Amino acid sequence: MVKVALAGCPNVGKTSLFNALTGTKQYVANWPGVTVEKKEGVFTYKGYTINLIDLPGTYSLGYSSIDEKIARDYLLKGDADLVILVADSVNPEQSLYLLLEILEMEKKVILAMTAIDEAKKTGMKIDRYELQKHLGIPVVFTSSVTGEGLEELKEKIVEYAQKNTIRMILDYGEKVESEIKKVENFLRDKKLRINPRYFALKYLSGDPEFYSEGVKLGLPELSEEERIGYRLLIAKRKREYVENVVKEAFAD
Numbered sequence: 001m002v003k004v005a006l007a008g009c010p011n012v013g014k015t016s017l018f019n020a021l022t023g024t025k026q027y028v029a030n031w032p033g034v035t036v037e038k039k040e041g042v043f044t045y046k047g048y049t050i051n052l053i054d055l056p057g058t059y060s061l062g063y064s065s066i067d068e069k070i071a072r073d074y075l076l077k078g079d080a081d082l083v084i085l086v087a088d089s090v091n092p093e094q095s096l097y098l099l100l101e102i103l104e105m106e107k108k109v110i111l112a113m114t115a116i117d118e119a120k121k122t123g124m125k126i127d128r129y130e131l132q133k134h135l136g137i138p139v140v141f142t143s144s145v146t147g148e149g150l151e152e153l154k155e156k157i158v159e160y161a162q163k164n165t166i167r168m169i170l171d172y173g174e175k176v177e178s179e180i181k182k183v184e185n186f187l188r189d190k191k192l193r194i195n196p197r198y199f200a201l202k203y204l205s206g207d208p209e210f211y212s213e214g215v216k217l218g219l220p221e222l223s224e225e226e227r228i229g230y231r232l233l234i235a236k237r238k239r240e241y242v243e244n245v246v247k248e249a250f251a252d
């Protein structure tokens, strides 16, 4: 039995892909403690039973808005074996930005470049090899309209699910990397439920959850100015990496 979460920005085609895979074998309930819909389904492939969770659309994984809280809580605290980042092939920048945040969690991720049927009609050339090179994860082109890639995606899910390990290591510059190392050193004995680098990034960025959990673990307070400053530098470096991936992997 394989549990997979579909993550992605608003309106990139998560549910269409979900439907294409599960058909009528799905149901809707609520996430615990709130009224927001949880959508879940199952399909069988080569005898495997693959359980699918269709997450709320999210541009980022902060901890202020209910969609982001739910998505992130599931990604960090749930029982998904792997994650499919559903990306809009025509307008991929926001998707790839979100992807970088998830890769930093050190989870197994497959990139599904969906609506490939619409993308190919622009004349654009998407180089799957260059995406794999720069993102370090399996990439599959999919269409919920034509069915392109759906079987390849199923194959990649089971192929990836069998591995005993997944690193997206983005250099944030001397200052941030220095502070990350300090945080990592300080937390060295603590029992964390996520890798210390991700923890450090969120604590430095003043994330409502990680900043508060960090302070509880003994980490010093940071000024509002500092937290805002780290948050912006981290976001900027992610944007720059996305720009570079798009330049290397996309052509007119």
Ligand SMILES: Nc1nc2c(ncn2[C@@H]2O[C@H](COP(=O)(O)OP(=O)(O)NP(=O)(O)O)[C@@H](O)[C@H]2O)c(=O)[nH]1
Residues within 6 Å of the ligand: 008, 009, 010, 011, 012, 013, 014, 015, 016, 017, 056, 057, 058, 114, 115, 116, 117, 118, 142, 143, 144, 145
């Ligand atoms: N051409 C094409 N259109 C697609 C494809 N997948 C989704 N769409 C279209 O994209 C729109 C958004 O699809 P949807 O599955 O609802 O996206 P979502 O990511 O689940 N949205 P949300 O974040 O609100 O939950 C719909 O109009 C859908 O028909 C695809 O593979 N090809």
Ligand SMILES: [Mg+2]
Residues within 6 Å of the ligand: 010, 011
């Ligand atoms: Mg929508």
Ligand SMILES: [Mg+2]
Residues within 6 Å of the ligand: 014, 015, 016, 054
């Ligand atoms: Mg949806």
